Amino acid sequence: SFTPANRAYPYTRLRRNRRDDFSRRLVRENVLTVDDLILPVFVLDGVNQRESIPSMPGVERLSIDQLLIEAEEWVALGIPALALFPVTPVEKKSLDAAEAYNPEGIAQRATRALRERFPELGIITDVALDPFTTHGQDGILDDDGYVLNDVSIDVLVRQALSHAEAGAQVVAPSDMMDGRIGAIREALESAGHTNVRVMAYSAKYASAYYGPFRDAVGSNKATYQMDPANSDEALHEVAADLAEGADMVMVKPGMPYLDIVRRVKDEFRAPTFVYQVSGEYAMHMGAIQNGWLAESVILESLTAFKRAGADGILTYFAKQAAEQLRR
Amino acid sequence: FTPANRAYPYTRLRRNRRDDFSRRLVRENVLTVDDLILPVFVLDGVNQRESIPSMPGVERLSIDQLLIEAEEWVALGIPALALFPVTPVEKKSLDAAEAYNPEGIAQRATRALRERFPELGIITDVALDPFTTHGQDGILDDDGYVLNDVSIDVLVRQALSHAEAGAQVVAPSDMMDGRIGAIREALESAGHTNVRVMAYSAKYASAYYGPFRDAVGSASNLGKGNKATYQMDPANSDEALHEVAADLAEGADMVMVKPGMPYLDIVRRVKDEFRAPTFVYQVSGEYAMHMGAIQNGWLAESVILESLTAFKRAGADGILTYFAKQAAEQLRR
Amino acid sequence: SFTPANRAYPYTRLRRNRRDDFSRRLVRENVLTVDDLILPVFVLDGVNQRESIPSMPGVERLSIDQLLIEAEEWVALGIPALALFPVTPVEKKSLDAAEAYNPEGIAQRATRALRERFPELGIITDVALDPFTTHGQDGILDDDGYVLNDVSIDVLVRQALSHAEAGAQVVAPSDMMDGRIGAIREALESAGHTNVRVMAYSAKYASAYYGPFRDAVGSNKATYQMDPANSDEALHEVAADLAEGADMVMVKPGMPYLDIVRRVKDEFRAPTFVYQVSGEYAMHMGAIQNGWLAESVILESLTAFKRAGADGILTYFAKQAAEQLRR
Amino acid sequence: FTPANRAYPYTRLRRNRRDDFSRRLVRENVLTVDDLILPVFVLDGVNQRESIPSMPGVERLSIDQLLIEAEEWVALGIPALALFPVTPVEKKSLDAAEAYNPEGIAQRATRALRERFPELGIITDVALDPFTTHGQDGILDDDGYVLNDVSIDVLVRQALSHAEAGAQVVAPSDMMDGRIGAIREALESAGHTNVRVMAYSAKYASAYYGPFRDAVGSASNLGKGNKATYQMDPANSDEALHEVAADLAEGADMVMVKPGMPYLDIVRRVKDEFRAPTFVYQVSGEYAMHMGAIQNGWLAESVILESLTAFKRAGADGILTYFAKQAAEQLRR
Amino acid sequence: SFTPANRAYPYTRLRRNRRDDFSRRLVRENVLTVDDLILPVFVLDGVNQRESIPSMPGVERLSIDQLLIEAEEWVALGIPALALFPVTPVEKKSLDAAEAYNPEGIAQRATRALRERFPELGIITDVALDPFTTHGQDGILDDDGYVLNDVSIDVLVRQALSHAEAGAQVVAPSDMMDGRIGAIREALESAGHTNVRVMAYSAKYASAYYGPFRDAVGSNKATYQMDPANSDEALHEVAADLAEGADMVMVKPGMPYLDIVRRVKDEFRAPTFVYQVSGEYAMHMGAIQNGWLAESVILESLTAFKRAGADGILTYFAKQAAEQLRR
Amino acid sequence: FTPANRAYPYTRLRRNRRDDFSRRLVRENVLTVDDLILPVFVLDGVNQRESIPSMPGVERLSIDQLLIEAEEWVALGIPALALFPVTPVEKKSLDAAEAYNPEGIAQRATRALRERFPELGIITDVALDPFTTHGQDGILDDDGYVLNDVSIDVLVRQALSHAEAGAQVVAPSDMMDGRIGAIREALESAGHTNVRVMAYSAKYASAYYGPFRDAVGSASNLGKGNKATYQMDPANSDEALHEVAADLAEGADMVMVKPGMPYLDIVRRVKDEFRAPTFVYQVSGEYAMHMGAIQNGWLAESVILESLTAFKRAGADGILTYFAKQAAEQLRR
Numbered sequence A, C, E: 001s002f003t004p005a006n007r008a009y010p011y012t013r014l015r016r017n018r019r020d021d022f023s024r025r026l027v028r029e030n031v032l033t034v035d036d037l038i039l040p041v042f043v044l045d046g047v048n049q050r051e052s053i054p055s056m057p058g059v060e061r062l063s064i065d066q067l068l069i070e071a072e073e074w075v076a077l078g079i080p081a082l083a084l085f086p087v088t089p090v091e092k093k094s095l096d097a098a099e100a101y102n103p104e105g106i107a108q109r110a111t112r113a114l115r116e117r118f119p120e121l122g123i124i125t126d127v128a129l130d131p132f133t134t135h136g137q138d139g140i141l142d143d144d145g146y147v148l149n150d151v152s153i154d155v156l157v158r159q160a161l162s163h164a165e166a167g168a169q170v171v172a173p174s175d176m177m178d179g180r181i182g183a184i185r186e187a188l189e190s191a192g193h194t195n196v197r198v199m200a201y202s203a204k205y206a207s208a209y210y211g212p213f214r215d216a217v218g219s220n221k222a223t224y225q226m227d228p229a230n231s232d233e234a235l236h237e238v239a240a241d242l243a244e245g246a247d248m249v250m251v252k253p254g255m256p257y258l259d260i261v262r263r264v265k266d267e268f269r270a271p272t273f274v275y276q277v278s279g280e281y282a283m284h285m286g287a288i289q290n291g292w293l294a295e296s297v298i299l300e301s302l303t304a305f306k307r308a309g310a311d312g313i314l315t316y317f318a319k320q321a322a323e324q325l326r327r
Numbered sequence B, D, F: 001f002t003p004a005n006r007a008y009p010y011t012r013l014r015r016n017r018r019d020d021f022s023r024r025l026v027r028e029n030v031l032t033v034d035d036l037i038l039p040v041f042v043l044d045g046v047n048q049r050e051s052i053p054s055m056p057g058v059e060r061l062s063i064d065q066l067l068i069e070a071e072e073w074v075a076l077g078i079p080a081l082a083l084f085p086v087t088p089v090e091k092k093s094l095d096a097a098e099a100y101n102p103e104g105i106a107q108r109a110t111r112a113l114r115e116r117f118p119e120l121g122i123i124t125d126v127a128l129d130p131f132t133t134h135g136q137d138g139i140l141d142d143d144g145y146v147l148n149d150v151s152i153d154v155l156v157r158q159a160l161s162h163a164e165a166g167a168q169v170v171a172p173s174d175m176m177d178g179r180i181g182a183i184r185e186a187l188e189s190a191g192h193t194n195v196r197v198m199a200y201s202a203k204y205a206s207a208y209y210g211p212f213r214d215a216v217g218s219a220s221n222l223g224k225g226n227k228a229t230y231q232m233d234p235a236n237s238d239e240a241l242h243e244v245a246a247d248l249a250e251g252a253d254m255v256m257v258k259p260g261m262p263y264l265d266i267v268r269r270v271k272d273e274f275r276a277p278t279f280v281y282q283v284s285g286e287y288a289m290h291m292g293a294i295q296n297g298w299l300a301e302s303v304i305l306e307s308l309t310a311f312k313r314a315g316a317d318g319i320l321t322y323f324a325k326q327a328a329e330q331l332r333r
């Protein structure tokens, strides 16, 4: 609700509160903290290795030993959680995506290593088949190349269970199959994984902003990911995921969809997350490196998510932002 | 909103996504050329064209060159331009008098375009930052503070000079309190009954303006200066509603949120609460970010229409965008 | 929500935005596009045949070969979908409406032909028994002449399945039996027709505006179709149809019910369709032909549906409108 | 709204539909004669009756004939008439002075009806289009634009002349900004304390007015002219709320949406947001469309009461309709 | 929603519309019609008999033959429905309330007689045990004198079925047992009484206004009927009854609860009824007979129900009101 | 509202009803003596007590008798009285001058009660109907119409005379447009800063006032007359919101709905929309109806507290009720 309350110039001058830092601080509506940050990480198969990514300047693919080294500092900075994205070797991709539930798959190995070394650090695993398929699509294809909904869910369920067994505190289904949150929740409950959180990618759009990620991980989408034009539809997606048992719901991409974040928080009043995707990172970082924009745009972009209603932000800027906030 | 007890598998939201025809039927928003406003940087002199390193693909244009390029903008159906003069260094002063010079770049450009393309909307910029030695949007007191009401007096003279030049829309971008009402009162008294006022209502103290300050040549003047005593704190959303309410009460015909994509939640709230003509500026930093990534091959050119569609979905009636020509071309196909 | 925001003349003059075409275009709230149009078509049994309809000037009943010819152009104009209405031969009408689920019935034959020749064109079939009954009522009658609800649903389910088997992407139950959307959805799901859309005629009124259609197809209603007086009741109809699995919901007739379209979109935020019925078409076309109204009323009438909240419009003017929009 | 977990088969919405008695009990809206206003076209002279080809069944009537026909309108219980003079060609001018002639058709007709039928509501039309050579609703400037405030001055004189003639309601149909407040101020100053103002608040730039322009004889004058600079864009709904809010603030006793059936969503929003006396005009084109189809045998005469019921359901308190006599007759039975 | 829209005297004078009858008629927000009236009738066991009721001046208990005579006129006046209340002979009252489901009970006999003679007249039977118990309470008592909820429902279900078998179009459970609407609906559906309406007495208050009725029929309540103090509680009652299948919901008593009628209509937008109870009738009629109030208060009281949001009114003034409306 | 998926048998609403203690815990509203205002009919002269046949148990009282009875009203904790003078026939006139007589019954009674019981609230009636020969609430023009603004002038003089007499609250019951603002302006100008105005905001043209008109002696004067040109149409609910909004804008400290029980929906809407101090009059006809039935043995005396509880539940902050003494007695026990 809102009421202008008959405020009128010059009795009301909105610049008065802007006059001094102390009053700007007092009326400041939102603040970003390190409690808000989730760091996505690209994880390699090998040992004592890192790789640079052409379209994601400054971001590295890390072997697990290197991931453990970097995590010490992420923990010291107070970053609450990581989101793991394995970089699957080619030999291990298949039509059936079986590597998704391999107990010795990269995601599973990385999860065990991190849970043991940093017990308080949140590990959010990715429940998705596209890192494991030869076609790079987010599911099992029928003979006509369509991603089969329910058949794909069966594999996602096995994958989610394997992550829970590896000790992940949160599994995050990013697949956009209908009904997958309920299927995964039912499976977790029956297997006794009472407290494993499900972070649903609820309103995930078919987007050009995912380009750099596809490079990072080494990977039509319009038949499952959402049309960028659609806002009301996002409410139905979130409503279903909450009914199906999600503990958190997410909007993807991020800044191009801040209106969706706002509507979702306003309507459901549930823990709401947003992904500042690879293309958003790359655009900002490229402009900063070129000297076109100041470093301050990073915190401005992240503050936007808070103002828009996000409880947490998956962002490749997490470390940089945490360092800035710590000072 | 009411979920209406929709549940999988009776409800599968992928069904409408299955085919292009059903995606088209349920598509909630569509960008058209009706939605686009093209900002243009205008140089003094004749036969001048200058590239802007921090805005790849954008040029500053002398009036003769502007008139030539506008032929294609008009052919593409772009409804309006927003003019930004590149003020010569020597014409900057403490008093910002060049703002209301009937022979200033903005005024000259307006008269030329109104004559040549009578149906094309011309939106002039009401602001003092192109004209001040310090790069601030108003007149400074002895403590270095941007004076509110004294600045309004100059903005009023500027707006009147634009109306006299034939501008159909004046757009105060200054963020002084109460300037919309002062400008409206002045336009009414002077008989400029139908000159629209496009208020920059919720304009934030942003870092995304860097490339624009280069383009217009205010960057050198501003130096490390900031605008936190007048432009809004990025953290604040409720405050934007109070800004818009005042500007509507004061007579604005349109209200604007600036920057754009980093403030889509503000666009949404403003449209939802006021149900008034709502505009959004996809600013220079947004343009530069996208361009840089496209030219690097990091993002497909399809991101341009995705970014612009977002504004429509968020509630904008129109978008000031440096991509206007490209977008119009892509929409025409 | 709304807030006048203390706007007052002469500070606020609403004519300023109206002063010039460019500003009218900038503030224009709604636009009709070809994405919004669905063309209903009356389909004959024979070959190389068309028939004119006295009460629907300009509209033709088409044999399937003629339908295929005209569809080439409808596709070229970008019309996304057709709604098929078979003109059932007399010999084939019965009390049990068995022709409804005949795999060689007109609707089924037309569907197969169109799906093969124009794979991207949406085909919306009509799930209804009134084209197939000897009494022309929308269901199976009991001994007292009442349309039996559940018994009629059993036939509608068989019909819907036959349309799915013929390849229809959308089935549209126009019958106004209670609970039929759920029964049809359950049947489609169990038979593996996962992606067949159901476009529910949710709030379909007992109306005098259907007269010309009844002539077109060669066909008391108050015991199932809605009382024109009732608005709140339409919300209950739509709520049930959404709970029962409808992918789209429709209001019928159209322009005499624009307030219903508005309420339905506002309350449910779901894909909402509206039928500009035969009587609406006939009124407009008659007035245009008589020289009483300009052709421009067509686009004005269709723009109304968009403004009122419709996502799509079933309209006999679809081709004319698409041609106007293309220029 | 709350669905309250209603589900088939426990909820079968056909149960209330099963019998006439239960349909009658749950029926949400009912049209009565309290709801009907009859527009009438008034000729100069004596013993004149003229048929209008594009409005079958409607006649232009001289005042003597009007008085005779009004006997039955009153007997049927129709609460009010809306008068539309058919101005002689020679009395049209640039200055629209005939609008405020105390001996103009509207004024004469008002005095005659107020004397003969003291309880019958008379709603006069405040607009300049019957009186201008160009057929526009106001006075034109040298650029062909309908001047806002100069036109208001004439409309004020017209409204005062109607009040002097005894009209209980004046209905400004002109769509000039601010005219409701100007007319109200003038009525108050002159002591016309109780003269109602029925604002045409959300009146659209429609194609459904064709037959009316024939009936009143403004068609020849307007030619191919349009009213897009004052009448509303059919695409716009939010804008209608701003129009109504201003007219209520300015003192309107009733507010109207025009045309009718193509704008039922606007009627609904206006009633919902303002909870004020809300009227709707079922315009000449709506009447003609229906009549044409009825006379062709394409639609049953029951469509008349269906069309009018729609207005009640949508939120209208009253309906200006050329079907008023027919409807009143059908309701009396 | 509401918005004052800055209306201010003297620009706004609300008396202008009040100045003349014609403008009062145009802006009049609500009208009572005969479509709104339901007439309760007290039915005797005998033949060729009527009885006067001391506390309900002008109201008569009628034998069935007399009821048929009076109904001819009620039908001629256009009253859509009657609500039957049998006056049970003493010999037939019992602890088990078995007379409630006797196929030859007064209510059942009256229903058959009326359905045969006036097929279009709505008959609403009373589903309640208090006309049949020796203690006059609304159910089966346990050993401590408490009205047992579920046990009482079992009897109410048998009663409702007996009314459906007698041909009643509407059964109206007036008992205020929890969950009885659902139990009755389930029973009607299973027995094939698809179209029998259930008019739930949803928010029925423990009231002093029922005194005269108790005399009419010849009959603690706070453990089932609602506390007069409670408004929010009425919303929960109605929500349950709608979920349980009620076709109409009712508020009882009437005029002392118009705020409840308003809230119920506003929140549920469902067919909403109100009972102007015996004490309301008696108060008004007594004052009229004493010459303290004019007859016009009858229509004023009934107009109140319409304005408050009622779709129909059970009122002992139905005939008088219908006569006034007819003139 | 949100049903929260409550379903039988997990939800049984009889559980809270099972025992007195849980009924008491969940009870949503409670009537107290804080809620009661007692209207009293005041006679001229000394030692006068008169019974009113159409209001059993109510007496008209001379000021000396009023002072005696008020001792018990005060002891019972009744916060305020509403005074209604029974004007002698000879003091009625066209000009209603007795309304502002400093020696009128209302004024005399106010001074006496303010002196004797300094803490007792005195609410005077601002209205001309006790003082006019015709029984209408204002001054009549030559057509028999109750003039709005001319009547306000007299009401203002009356209200000032009440403030001078010491009334803490003046209650304009007249239903003239704009009278609240006129009275407030006058009170402010005269220094009556803290005199409350209890507006009769939504007062209906009701038939439930009959016994009151007997009690005050206006019945003979009014005869068959009506008040439909100023009191509200019983059919209208939205209109009541506009009445209240104006009275709040005009400065009312409290707003009232009248009659009471037949208008509980209006009380509810008014409280819900304005969240202001909201009062309701349980009028003479409501009192008479209840009394008649109680004395006949048709209703138990418990109906009195049931009727009054309804007002609290519906949203009233206070109730003007002829049952105030009985209710206070029953609440004290």
Ligand SMILES: [Mg+2]
Residues within 6 Å of the ligand: A176, A177, A178, A179, A202, A237, A240, A241, B013
């Ligand atoms: Mg989903």
Ligand SMILES: [Mg+2]
Residues within 6 Å of the ligand: A014, B175, B176, B177, B178, B201, B243, B246, B247
């Ligand atoms: Mg501002």
Ligand SMILES: [Mg+2]
Residues within 6 Å of the ligand: C176, C177, C178, C179, C202, C237, C240, C241, D013
């Ligand atoms: Mg249905």
Ligand SMILES: [Mg+2]
Residues within 6 Å of the ligand: C014, D175, D176, D177, D178, D201, D243, D246, D247
């Ligand atoms: Mg206007």
Ligand SMILES: [Mg+2]
Residues within 6 Å of the ligand: E176, E177, E178, E179, E202, E237, E240, E241, F013
């Ligand atoms: Mg209950």
Ligand SMILES: [Mg+2]
Residues within 6 Å of the ligand: E014, F175, F176, F177, F178, F201, F243, F246, F247
């Ligand atoms: Mg008032």
